[PDB]
Design a protein around this ligand. Structure first.
Ligand SMILES: *Cc1c(COP(=O)(O)O)cnc(C)c1O
Ligand SMILES: *Cc1c(COP(=O)(O)O)cnc(C)c1O
Lengths: 925, 950
């Protein structure tokens, strides 16, 4: 149009997202000996599996309009005061943690702390989170987060099965309903029988029961003594698992002190938004003797090469990347970032501030309780923390009518009674609205005057907490705003992130997490809605779900998406369970991510491994296209046809090599998870949050996950896989914004440049290191493997030496020893420009020459920069220097590493064995 | 006495507990160190009894931090965000979100102040050098400063520069300059003694050789692009200078002032990625020819060497500024708009010349399109050639147009003569063009108008053909990934409040809280045009009233004027109001202003700018105003006495015993009392300047009331006045503030309105109790530090009973004789201990002045005292011969990373002593000075004030 020539688009976000401009791409193409981008794709991606017609999507939205566009959606939501409860409680998110951690690119762009020596910040903070959970729950050791409350409870069930092998598990029906549904789904496919029984109905006599799950306080609000239940279970060989609340436990005697084996719940009310379901770090802590069976990551204390006390992920042999189908769970990405928010919450308040918040909430509930009783309403339970169950003396409708006038939501119980869960945000004004809602012609002031100040409730009961918590210096040091900012910065600056340098982690897609994408996750219209609100309050979210679904259906070739799964691994489990509901043998290549076999074990499938040939190539199969080695298989249609002849799950984690070029649904796949936090810009967050939505073909849609609280429907659902119906809803705007900004053209170009960048790097490094696997005509997809294994024989150099030595050149290492042990796998993504790629290649080329010096007797084979790496500031600034290379070689190996940009590894090399032999997983004194 | 509810259900939080560092335990220990039982005893012994409050501050109940944003939202949502195409120097722009998030809302960019200590400030120094380079390239002039306050104040500075250059008393102003620009220039001329004349180029008479300079605008306020070559040449042939107000976006496609002979180019940098802000803050630009640079106002970054010979940055030719030359300085300006200059530089780095040309072409073509649509519809365009601004005579009724405009919530500029101004901007899309065309009754769409259309600037002789932004810095960081990395690189070179206490005397480096900062980027504050109709800014009005009333109550004044956009502007404004009052009263012969020699350099400069005869008053050996010399000087000038400028407490941190007497004395002899409020952090909740005889004070919101220091701006300097001065307070020619106004001192009626919420939020969160406690702890902390250092260094001045206020001076001068150690040695050596130095060599040369503020806790204060105590022992080593006097830690400081990690080490102390002097300085928190010691003389001898190659 002539308008478009006179008045072009204001901006094109693809130009900001994609690093290499025109000049870079031409030069990279010259380096590959190719005339154009299309030629590269034609020589990489098999012709017969490419798209017929280009992605059909909306015209791209300029970056300078994306927030107004999205506001037109989010403003459709209504922000009521929700006192629904059910595991989500509004809280006061300290603005300084929101600003300096959540909206800080130096906290949120890094991923899992695999490389500890450039990750001590987030490792300390996750150690703070564990310490907090252990102190408050009263149990011995806690993990570095699970996905949500209900999954954490399923993991408790699974832990119990792993401990004693018994096929029965008793559930208290007073657990939250979404918790029950997720535990029953896991039990169903793991082969364990669950029974809904109250403590008095629970029969342990038969010595068949693995464990019991109850809640404290329970879903109705009641505080109950489980000492006797726990003792009865113990005398019959069963374990006792307790879902709980960290705020409640600030004044309640905790599960640890009435014999509980496993304590779990959500950390959400410790300073994290409602988020319309997530993301929230769940907690999960166990007795000392159960720790070998712990799920997820767990920070421990160890030594470095100098003997300094330092942090690192401990007992890693439990996890998916080592033990695969024999692992303690399929979980990979958890909710590291939001665990760190909650730990900062507890550091900022201290035990003293958490007691103040908890007492205040409880007294506000006690006050409301007396007001309602005065007015002729009936309270079902005398002792509670923050939650009342009310039989209305007057009409329930007229109450709800008034409640609607003050825009307040209650929990509507099946039996016609009401749930009210007060929280940290509740003040006098709200109590007055609440008392007016129930027709009590008395204010909160006046009700309080005739209560007196004899202690009542929890402080006046035998359930009074007497044990201390958060006595470590870290929880009693950073209470001024000035101090917490300084502390958050100190830990930030220890962690190498995307504000520093490329993090080319294979199968992680460390691409740009844009500001404009990130902004909306802290908008009140997304962050401050309770997941279980009536749907007329969440019509903005509905529209977001539809638009993102439709877009994702179009990129993948599937028919319907389910947002419920809140990690890739959860999507695999969900996808496999949907295949089983539609219908047990699951074929899995040995090249598959460790989540693949673990998910299948969790979904109750018999795993048959399939071998990989020497060129790297190969109820259901799990495939990945491209290969977890970055190579496109020539005849993937044939594999899909073959399985269908006798369903096909396709792992989507490598979709950044596909988008706008080919689609898994077009070539025979029935179901895929997508990693939104890897391909679609959700921030990696130090190891979470992520989302793992599954696209399915028409025929699987009737069996997709449902939810017992908010209904997601010929339906025949597999069950329920996450605590919240659409998982971590509040981070979904990030991927919607990427997609709507990029458009069809931009998304295609991003995939193009991801492949270009990976091949350019491989090309540059091919005469220095072996590129282990390639496609039929020699080209890789979006990543490649450098075979460092030969340097073991020639120089006694291991991949780990190269990993640590890279830190000295200003780079986080690529992915290590997977899919192939003793190798590096490299994924630059599209967001990094030529000069950044050239620095990484030059660092590797220079390291190659260091290996050559050892291979040639030019430098001591025991004491060289590779074996002594990383080189800390304390090492390099010491007066003591007794090494046969200079300090310049150690810390500034090439001229692009300058004092002006020098990132310091904060410690010497990590000792892996020592920490697991001296297991300490709480902040030491 | 409390309600039962308040005991069962106390306040959710108290922000004073987060703002004030020392808790109960700290304060008890500090009190023990002072030998005092309680806080009240301290105050009783510090602040004289007779000037203290008779009753507590009467203020609203404090607002919990967890409700402050909801409370403020109830005010801000009263504003209406229309699409404003008013123009008049403010043009909506698309603020790149990544710069907003990673710079504006980064505490690592905004908490630091003026880059006095260059070796821990190279980041923001490079960025200000980027800003200068950008201005110089785009304007085509030789050297630019590191920001002025706004467009109109920059134009007044041009007038003043011209007077300084040639001493002629006439200055010609084009009436097609923006009206607020004219009003601010006329106000400055009025009190400086220069006569302005409003004359069009053809009416301008340069032939008498009595014209200092001329000011015109390009494009002018009506939108027109005109050739000023001949005007400039005529002025030059008669000895006058030519000053040009301009627009940086416009100049991306227009040949700039540099290429038609202009001597001074200025304007606002606001379009380059900074919000409308309902007036501010925006960095103004100001650039000059090579030969005029000695007379430059403000700061200016220059290139120099460090001790190793490395190329590095620092503030250049500092002898021009207020802190050195005082009343002989090139201006009174101190705090400028450093942070917003850095935003605009990042804007230009992110877009490059190529992206700025794209934005500018797009805006211009959007205007050309609108232009053809209006002509088709029967409306008359007054000027053929424009950038983004049309002047329209409506073919139909103006009312029916404005009626329709109101229906699409669009504002135009209403000219006095019944015509309309429309200024398009970067935010204007097809949809808006269509609304605009519908507004004027053109039934054609933008698409259709465009189909029947190079013309405009590209088709004219005004086409820009000169390049700009050819340096690598403007062609390197176009990916979002790169610009984030670049902003971080510069952030991490700058020590800030995310690292350690910055105890800068006379700066009040207190907490800039997140919850206070959050609202400044709310659309309801950030995206309103300063000249909108007032029914669109009723939230702002309510904010102004509430903050005014609160500030009136803390100060004892009757009315506040928010127009002045720095403390120094408030001084100038306050002094000018005193002169207008005196003129009204029959007493304009009174021009003498008495100023103690201890006064901030802004004091004498402001008085010179306001046209007062300065008489210095001496200070005695005890640090007080010399009562004999004062009495003499009062008597000498009693018939001509206009004012005194005092500071309570003194600029040395001491409370004067008889300040009432000083005020009474001046009032006895026919003059008014101006009180410099910059030290109000020692007063709030305890005493009030209005109660003891003061008539007028500026307050520094960016010092006492939590506005972020921003690397040297932004600030606000509101003046409180007594009833009798209120009729003479500044007004504004566009939005009426009323009366017999002094004139207009800032471009925007309430200055930088969008940062005012920060101080409102501090005040409403703290309450009467919290504000008092903050002042209490500021005084406690300062005395505790002085107490701990008194046997190692001389505390130069104290109050009558031995106690200081909120700051104190360490007399380091004796170490010159005993060890050949200068204050600067101590300043640089402190960097090695992880601290930015305190304020240096003012009020007393060769000394350090220390202000911890209330926001820092005991352990942080103890770290600073231990660093000083340890440095004392280093000085002792030189005094007693234990270490070389030339080569020791103090003389070699700061110690950079490159120095300490070198293989070559030839110093008589260890690397550990150099970089980790005490155990609290650890690898895990080590802040590195990024360069060796700065060479001060070399840079001023080899003046280079733009980014050098590569
Ligand atoms: C990264 C990745 C996953 C991620 O699973 P999460 O639970 O989201 O961490 C799964 N599969 C493959 C092949 C991956 O590369
Ligand atoms: C900071 C200051 C000023 C002027 O403030 P600006 O905002 O920089 O103009 C005046 N007097 C004293 C004592 C100051 O500290």
């Amino acid at each position: 149009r002539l308008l478009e020539r006179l008045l072009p688009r204001h901006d094109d976000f693809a130009r900001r997202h994609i690093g290499p401009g025109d000049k870079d791409q031409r030069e990279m193409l010259q380096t590959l000996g190719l005339a154009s981008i299309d030629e590269l794709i034609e020589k990489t991606v098999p012709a017969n599996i490419r798209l017929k017609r280009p992605l059909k999507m909306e015209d791209p939205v300029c970056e300078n309009e994306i927030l107004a566009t999205l506001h037109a959606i989010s403003s459709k939501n209504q922000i009521w005061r929700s006192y629904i409860g059910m595991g989500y409680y509004n809280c006061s998110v300290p603005q300084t943690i929101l600003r300096n951690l959540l909206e800080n690119s130096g906290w949120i762009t890094q991923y899992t702390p695999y490389q500890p020596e450039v990750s001590q910040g987030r490792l300390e903070s996750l150690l703070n989170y564990q310490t907090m959970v252990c102190d408050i729950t009263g149990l011995d050791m806690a993990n570095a987060s699970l996905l949500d409350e209900g999954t954490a409870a399923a993991e408790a069930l699974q832990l119990c099965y792993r401990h004693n092998k018994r096929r029965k598990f008793l559930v208290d029906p007073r657990c939250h309903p979404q918790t029950i549904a997720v535990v029953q789904t896991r039990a169903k496919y793991t082969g364990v029988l669950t029974e809904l029984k109250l403590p008095c109905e629970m029969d342990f006599s038969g010595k068949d029961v693995s464990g019991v799950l109850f809640q404290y306080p329970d879903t109705e609000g009641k505080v109950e003594d489980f000492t006797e239940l726990v003792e009865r279970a113990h005398q019959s060989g069963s374990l006792a698992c307790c879902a709980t609340d960290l705020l409640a436990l600030c004044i309640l005697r905790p599960p640890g002190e009435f014999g509980v084996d496993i304590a779990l719940g959500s950390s959400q009310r410790f300073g994290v938004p409602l988020g319309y379901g997530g993301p929230h770090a769940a907690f999960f802590a166990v007795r000392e003797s159960l720790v070998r069976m712990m799920p997820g990551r767990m920070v421990g204390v160890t030594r470095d090469a100098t003997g300094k006390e330092v942090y690192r992920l401990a007992l890693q042999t439990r996890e998916q990347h080592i033990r695969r189908d024999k692992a303690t769970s399929n979980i990979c990405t958890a909710q590291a970032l939001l665990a760190n928010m909650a730990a900062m919450f507890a550091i900022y308040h201290g035990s003293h501030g958490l007691e103040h918040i908890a007492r205040r909430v409880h007294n506000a509930t006690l006050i409301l309780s007396e007001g309602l009783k005065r007015a002729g309403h009936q309270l079902q339970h005398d002792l509670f923390f923050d939650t009342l169950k009310i039989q209305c003396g007057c009409s329930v409708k007229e109450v709800l009518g008034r409640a609607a006038q003050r825009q307040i939501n209650f929990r509507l119980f099946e039996d016609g009674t009401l749930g009210i869960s007060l929280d940290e945000t509740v003040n006098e004004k709200d109590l007055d609205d609440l008392l007016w809602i129930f027709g009590c012609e008395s204010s909160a002031e006046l009700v309080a005057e005739s209560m007196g100040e004899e202690c009542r409730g929890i402080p006046g009961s035998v359930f009074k907490r007497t044990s201390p918590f958060l006595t470590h210096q870290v929880f009693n040091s950073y209470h001024s705003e000035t101090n917490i900012v300084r502390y958050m910065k100190k830990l930030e600056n220890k962690d190498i992130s995307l504000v520093h340098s490329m993090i080319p982690l294979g199968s992680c897609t460390m691409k740009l997490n844009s500001s404009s994408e990130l902004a909306p996750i802290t908008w009140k219209e997304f962050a401050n809605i309770h997941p279980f609100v009536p749907l007329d309050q969440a019509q903005g979210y509905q529209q977001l779900f539809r638009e993102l679904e439709k877009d994702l259906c179009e990129l993948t070739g599937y028919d319907q998406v389910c947002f419920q799964p809140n990690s890739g691994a959860q999507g695999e489990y969900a996808g496999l369970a949907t295949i089983r509901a539609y219908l047990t043998v699951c074929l899995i290549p040995k090249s598959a991510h460790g989540t693949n076999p673990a998910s299948a074990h969790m979904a109750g499938m018999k795993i048959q491994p399939v071998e990989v040939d020497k060129y790297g190539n190969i109820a259901a199969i799990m495939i990945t296209y491209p290969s977890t080695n970055g190579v496109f298989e020539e005849n993937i249609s044939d594999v899909c046809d073959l399985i269908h002849q006798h369903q096909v799950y396709l792992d989507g984690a490598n979709m950044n090599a596909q988008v706008g070029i080919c689609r898994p649904g077009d070539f025979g796949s029935d179901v895929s998870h997508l990693n939104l936090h890897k391909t679609f810009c959700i921030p990696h967050g130090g190891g979470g949050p992520g989302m793992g939505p599954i696209g399915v073909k028409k025929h699987l849609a009737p069996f997709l996950p449902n939810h017992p609280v908010i209904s997601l429907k010929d339906a025949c659902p597999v069950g329920t896989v996450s605590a919240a119906p659409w998982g971590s809803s509040s981070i979904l705007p990030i991927s919607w914004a990427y997609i709507k900004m990029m458009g069809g053209k931009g998304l295609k170009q991003a995939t193009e440049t991801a492949i270009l960048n990976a091949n350019y790097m491989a090309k540059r490094l091919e005469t220095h290191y072996r590129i282990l696997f390639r496609g039929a005509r020699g080209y890789v997809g979006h990543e490649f493997i450098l075979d460092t294994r030969p340097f073991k024989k020639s120089a006694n150099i291991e991949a780990v030496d190269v990993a640590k030595r890279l830190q000295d050149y200003g780079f986080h290492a690529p992915t290590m020893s997977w899919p192939v042990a003793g190798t590096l796998m490299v994924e630059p993504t599209e967001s990094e420009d030529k000069a950044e790629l050239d620095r990484f290649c030059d660092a590797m080329i220079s390291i190659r020459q260091e290996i050559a010096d050892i291979e040639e007797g030019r430098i001591d084979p025991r004491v060289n920069p590779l074996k002594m790496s990383p080189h800390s500031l304390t090492c390099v600034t010491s007066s003591h220097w007794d090494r046969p290379y200079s300090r310049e070689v150690a810390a500034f190996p090439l001229p692009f590493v300058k004092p002006e940009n020098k990132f310091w590894p904060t410690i010497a090399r990590i000792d892996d064995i020592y920490g697991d032999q001296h297991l300490v997983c709480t902040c030491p004194p």
